[PDB]
């Protein structure tokens, strides 16, 4: 006959959600002086990750439907709106004309307006009214603007588990993306997670350590997105060959005269490395689909411009790169990009965040690690499966970094049938 | 606060019940929310401090934790002798405390003395 005894040091845990508090690396003190995107007075605590490997234990991770990505997406939106809020709202008909000096079709328009003057805009930020040109979302969405002294840029933002909770991680190199993970380890503070805020491609992402990883809830169903993680990143480089002044109570900012030749940023990517990466991707896909099905890579289907193009942040500006060339192949280097100022960033009505013009060239180098691929219909049985890129919901972009984490509440109290009475 | 619901009931019912027992920064009226959060954490910290002091008293009375603790000092006659049935069956805890409020200091002193004597004569042998 055994007796019940309760222990209060048991390491049993159970999954639960919790508002994780951000903590940027120490060196952010040197950058946060600029009031940048890089965190705020919202707990910039100095972290120190101390990994502790477990043993003989397998936990069932599920990166899909993982609350931490929703939590950190909400945190990022809160940080963005906190940075944007102190800045001045615009709240403004503009007479526009076609002006070009050495371009090439000219997107730029010389808009004019009378106040008690002249500026240059882009076709993507204005519509014809009845010539008369009015910038989009004029009477509906508070356009607002950003303070040019914020200079938003991504930074690592570690997540440290609260006092009573633990953050598990899957050290297994070839992580399936779901199911048991034989290589699990607790970690006080997550690694340098970075706010990529990029569409249809992943910039400054996390590299894998074996063949390019494929992951999705179903690879079968074509409704759910497909996340691809690279191993040999391909570089993307281009500038903003332009300069503009700042106009001026009537605290209104706009563009000015352009110095030098006018031409859109073409941007470049190594072609052989891109082909090799796509070959690795197709090799991995054949494993999940079959070693004989024809695979295709067409261009984005359409819809909002944020999903048709590849949108990314660069040096206080935003580039929308036509990505027809990169995803164009059928298996058995340059890509034009537009620029626009009003940014319906997180598909939210009422926010535009008019980007102030940048002065000079930037030449941001950004090396790609991840793809978002959405399949096509499966009417053609075993004939072909096309993989047009798409997406745009940033939850995927952040699930690319939080696939190897899970918050667990420690349940120290436990019972056991030992041989001892009182 | 929180455990006021059981008030007004019989000591039997009260004893049985006690035995069983990411916000963004876009919210409107932020100052009221943060001030009332300050107040709520003040309340919770004062609650944990009051609980710690009460547990220290229970420990000095030889009970440590526990809720229904039993001791060894007899119930004196002067402390409002009444029939136990009507004490524990009809009236409520608030009225009982109002009735015994005049004597609680003597109760605590006798309880501490009894526990100290129990410790002394238990460590004696």
């Amino acid at each position, epitope marked *: 006959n055994l007796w019940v005894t309760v222990y209060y040091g048991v390491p049993v845990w159970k999954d639960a959600e919790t508002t994780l508090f951000c903590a940027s690396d120490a060196k952010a003190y040197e950058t946060k002086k600029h009031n940048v995107w890089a965190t705020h007075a919202c707990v910039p605590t100095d972290p120190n990750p101390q990994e502790i490997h477990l043993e003989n234990v397998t936990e069932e991770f599920n990166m899909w439907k993982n609350n931490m990505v929703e939590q950190m997406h909400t945190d990022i939106i809160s940080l963005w709106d906190q940075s944007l809020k102190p800045c001045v709202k615009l709240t403004p008909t503009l007479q526009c004309t076609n002006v070009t000096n050495n371009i090439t079709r000219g997107e730029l328009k010389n808009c004019s307006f009378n106040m008690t003057v002249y500026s240059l805009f882009y076709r993507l930020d204005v519509v014809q009214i009845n010539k008369e040109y009015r910038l989009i979302n004029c009477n509906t969405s508070a356009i607002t603007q950003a303070c040019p002294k914020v200079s938003f840029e991504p930074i690592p933002i570690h997540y440290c588990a609260p006092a009573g909770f633990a953050i598990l991680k899957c050290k297994d190199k070839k992580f399936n993306g779901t199911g048991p993970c034989p290589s699990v380890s607790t970690v006080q503070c997550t690694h340098g997670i970075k706010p990529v805020v990029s569409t249809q491609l992943l910039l400054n992402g996390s590299l894998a350590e074996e063949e390019v990883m494929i992951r999705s809830e179903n690879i079968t169903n074509n409704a759910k997105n497909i996340l691809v993680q690279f191993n040999t990143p391909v570089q993307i480089n281009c500038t903003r060959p332009n300069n503009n002044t700042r106009k001026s109570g009537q605290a209104f900012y706009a563009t000015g005269d352009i110095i030098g030749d006018i031409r859109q940023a073409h941007c470049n990517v190594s072609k052989a490395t891109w082909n090799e990466t796509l070959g690795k991707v197709v090799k991995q896909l054949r494993k999940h689909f079959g070693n004989n099905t024809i695979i295709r890579f067409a261009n984005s289907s359409g819809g909002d411009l944020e999903v048709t193009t590849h949108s990314f942040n660069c040096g206080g500006e935003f580039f929308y790169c036509n990505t027809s060339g990169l995803f164009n192949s059928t298996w058995i280097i340059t890509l034009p990009c537009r620029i626009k100022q009003i940014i319906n960033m997180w598909q939210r009505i009422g926010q535009a965040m008019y980007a102030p013009p940048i002065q000079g060239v930037i030449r941001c180098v950004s090396n790609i690690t991840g793809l978002i691929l959405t399949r*096509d219909g499966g009417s053609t049985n075993s004939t072909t499966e096309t993989f047009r890129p798409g997406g745009g919901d940033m939850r995927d972009n952040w699930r690319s970094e939080l696939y190897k984490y899970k918050v667990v509440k420690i349940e120290p109290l436990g019972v056991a049938p030992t041989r001892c009475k009182r | 606060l929180g455990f006021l619901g059981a008030a007004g009931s019989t000591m039997g019912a009260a004893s049985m019940t006690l035995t069983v027992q990411r916000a963004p920064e876009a919210q409107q009226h932020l100052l009221k929310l943060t001030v009332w959060g300050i107040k709520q954490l003040q309340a919770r910290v004062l609650a944990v401090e009051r609980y710690l002091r009460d547990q220290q008293l229970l420990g000095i009375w030889g009970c440590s934790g526990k809720l229904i603790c039993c001791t060894n000092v007899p119930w004196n006659s002067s402390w409002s002798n009444r029939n136990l049935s009507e004490i524990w069956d009809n009236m409520t805890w608030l009225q009982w405390d109002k009735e015994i409020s005049n004597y609680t200091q003597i109760i605590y002193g006798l309880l501490e003395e009894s526990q100290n004597q129990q410790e002394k004569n238990e460590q004696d042998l």
Partner: antibody
Amino acid sequence: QVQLQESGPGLVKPSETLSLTCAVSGGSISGNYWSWIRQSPGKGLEWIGHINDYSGRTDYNPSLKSRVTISTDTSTNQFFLTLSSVSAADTAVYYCARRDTDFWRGIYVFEFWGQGVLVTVSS
Amino acid sequence: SVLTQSPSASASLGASVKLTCTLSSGLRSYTIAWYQRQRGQAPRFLLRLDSVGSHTKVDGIPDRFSGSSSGTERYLTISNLQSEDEADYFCQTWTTGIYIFGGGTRLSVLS
């Protein structure tokens, strides 16, 4: 499986706030997006608003920003729609639905709709 | 941007009907979704539909429902019409965070 069931007043006189409560069973624990939609009689339906079940962030149609407020209740798995200053033209069949979390090539759809409740504005 | 579509259409039982949804000029390559609302029952999500006819699927719907695309037009084709097809089918899209709905095709079957 997600089930939406809505209720509220059937007859509402002009010029006050109309309150409609939609409860949900079997919805995801968090990260959900609950949307209120209405269809005026004999005219194409229009979107009213939507609430993020976790963040608490709301959003509304630009032409109904002031008159519409959507609140959530995680404890009872419910959300409340309040339409301030209802007019005679706001009579409609109201649906509470859940908008998906896939964003397939630039669409958000409402897989799970409510049964619909008819609200008529009369004397 | 308005989702122009035919107000009414009908066909005999057991035949195939082809409901149409025409996008505006500014929504040439936009992808849409089809919604079916029977009499009294809650609206039921049917299928998405993109520029090249690549359409998703959902459980609980008959396989007879099919989608197709042609430039600025999207066609919902139904084969082997039943009595339960008495309904209203409308097309919906998402340009910005604001949804845009069609007028609703009242589709009826003949007994």
